[PDB]
């Protein structure tokens, strides 16, 4: 078959067919970093405000992990 | 029957075309 989806109803038809990109590659990498840190110890607006709390938390988790391993190294430089 | 009901229930009067 051949569909013709207009631009007004495009995300809704695509999410309907699902039930019947460098941005979300980067955010996939950031969710992978959040999955590595824990192991180490929808509308368009509803995605757009939750990608904000993915990025805003990935930034603080990365800086707090990089201010922790580089401090563990400084600890071992005194224990040696 | 599912594409026809869904594009009409949300307004946005620009219907899709489903050919075979």
């Amino acid at each position: 078959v051949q569909l013709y989806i207009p631009l007004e109803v495009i995300r809704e038809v695509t999410f309907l067919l699902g039930k019947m990109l460098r941005r979300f590659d980067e955010v996939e990498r950031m969710v992978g970093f959040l999955n590595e840190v824990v192991e180490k110890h929808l509308s368009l607006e509803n995605v757009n405000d939750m990608v904000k709390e993915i990025t805003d938390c990935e930034s603080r988790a990365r800086q707090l992990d990089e201010s922790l391993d580089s401090l563990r190294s400084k600890l071992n430089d005194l224990l040696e | 029957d599912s594409l026809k009901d869904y594009i009409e229930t949300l307004g946005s009067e620009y219907s899709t075309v489903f050919n075979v």
């Binding site: 368009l44 904000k52 201010s67 400084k74 | -």
Partner: protein, 461 residues
């Protein structure tokens, strides 16, 4: 003519017409027992017969006569409704419209009948007066100012828990606002209607669009209520002084617009929210530098705008507003001198993060400048962080804001220059930081840990 075309096919207005039309009031009997004369009743009857079918504004004068002379709300609502029905239709009652319009006297007479009995009564009359004022062959500011001052029309407007009342009232006000002259009188009575207009908008933000209620959701009735409120606003704000005045009074309520844009998909609600902000951020507006700070900082305008830029709306104009607003807020903060901003915050003792106040560059330029008595300005900052914790305690709203900022500023400076390490030790700031790890709130212990790690790195590598 067919006067105004709004409020004829409008749904809330149709709901009000049903009640009036349902009821049947015989003029003939009222007229015979005396409350009006046979001639007024003959005209009113004949008037119904013209509307339903076939071919007067000659009929206009006895109906004006009837309205005034009678006190009975039921007959007067049926007379006033019939007059409204003609006024808007260009298939029925083109001649009617001309008759008001030529002679201002029957308008002032129609204004008389306003502010009488039931709430439906005041709507209908208000709708007819407003239709002639916006035709450009007559205008009177006094009518509009006068109608505003009154109790009854504002009381009807204030209620929002009957869709019908609010819908009509906001529209009467707003329609008149299109014409530049009213904007000035409408603004005088602002303080009465304006919190209510804000209440409808806020009310929409809190109730989820994921449902359907019939009161105000994503359905046509709600979409119009939001739109009308924002449109009334936008219109006043076009004048350069008014807009400055709007931000300073309504600040809390104003910030809520950002929120509307986010929850809606509706290109009507959203374009207008962004636009109303854009007008106030404009160069033309007095004290635009102040309003821009306030918006960006408190309301999170910059971050909210930046996110929006990726997820644009189909209509072009919407896109233009998103781009133009984005540029002013961002441009404005960075383009001020780095040294100025830092000195200004430390002195007044009020500190807050800002776009160029958190940048690495800001510090890099400003280090050298500090030196006057071994980095005297930086030293004053460490002194401020020290002071706050000891005096007046900690975890009091004001004092807590400053600490996180003061601690952000000190990390960047320290990480940059190794000579800063002596300054922490001499002043005695180095110990204060160790306590701050222990002092409550996540942002405070976070900032203290960063503040400590920068110091450590130069002492012992």
């Amino acid at each position: 003519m067919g006067a105004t075309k709004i409020l004829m096919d409008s749904t809330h207005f149709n709901e009000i017409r049903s009640i009036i039309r349902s009821r049947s009031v015989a003029w003939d009997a009222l007229a015979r027992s005396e409350e009006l004369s046979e001639i007024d009743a003959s005209t009113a009857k004949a008037l119904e017969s013209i509307l339903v079918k076939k071919n007067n504004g000659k009929t206009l004068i006895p109906l004006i006569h009837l309205l005034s002379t009678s006190d009975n709300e039921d007959c007067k609502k049926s007379v006033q409704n019939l007059i409204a029905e003609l006024l808007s239709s260009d298939k029925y009652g083109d001649d009617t419209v001309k008759f008001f319009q030529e002679d201002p006297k029957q308008l002032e007479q129609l204004f008389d009948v306003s502010l009488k009995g039931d709430f439906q009564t005041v709507l209908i009359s208000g709708f007819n007066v407003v239709s002639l004022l916006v035709q450009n062959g007559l205008h009177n500011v006094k009518l509009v100012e006068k109608l505003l001052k009154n109790n009854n029309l504002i009381n009807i407007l204030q209620n929002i828990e009957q869709m019908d009342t609010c819908y009509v009232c906001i529209r009467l006000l707003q329609e008149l606002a299109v014409i530049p002259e009213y904007r000035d009188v409408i603004w005088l009575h602002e303080k009465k209607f304006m919190p209510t207009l804000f209440k409808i908008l806020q009310r929409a933000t809190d109730s989820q669009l994921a449902t359907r209620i019939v009161a105000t959701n994503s359905n046509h009735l709600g979409i119009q209520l939001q739109y009308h409120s924002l449109l009334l606003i936008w219109l006043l704000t076009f004048n350069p002084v008014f807009a400055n005045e709007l931000v300073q009074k309504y600040l809390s309520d104003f910030l809520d617009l950002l929120k509307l844009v986010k929850i809606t998909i509706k290109e009507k609600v959203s374009r207008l929210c962004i636009s109303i902000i854009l007008q106030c951020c404009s160069t033309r507006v007095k004290q635009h530098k102040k309003v821009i700070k306030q918006l960006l900082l408190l309301g999170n305008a910059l971050p909210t705008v930046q996110s929006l830029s990726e997820r644009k709306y189909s209509d072009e104009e919407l896109r233009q507003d998103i781009s133009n607003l984005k540029e002013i807020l961002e441009n404005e903060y960075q383009e001020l001198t780095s040294f100025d901003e830092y000195v200004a915050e430390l002195d007044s003792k009020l500190l807050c993060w800002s776009p160029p106040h958190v940048d690495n560059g800001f510090w890099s330029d400003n280090i050298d400048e500090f030196k006057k008595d071994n980095y005297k300005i930086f030293r004053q900052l460490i002194e401020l962080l020290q002071a706050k914790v000891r005096n007046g305690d900690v975890n009091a709203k004001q004092e807590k804001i400053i600490i996180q900022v003061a601690l952000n500023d000190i990390t960047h400076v320290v990480e940059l220059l190794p000579e800063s390490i002596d300054v922490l030790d001499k002043t005695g700031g180095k110990a204060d930081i160790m306590e701050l790890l222990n002092h409550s709130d996540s942002r405070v212990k976070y900032e203290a840990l960063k503040a400590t790690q920068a110091i450590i790195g130069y002492t012992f590598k």
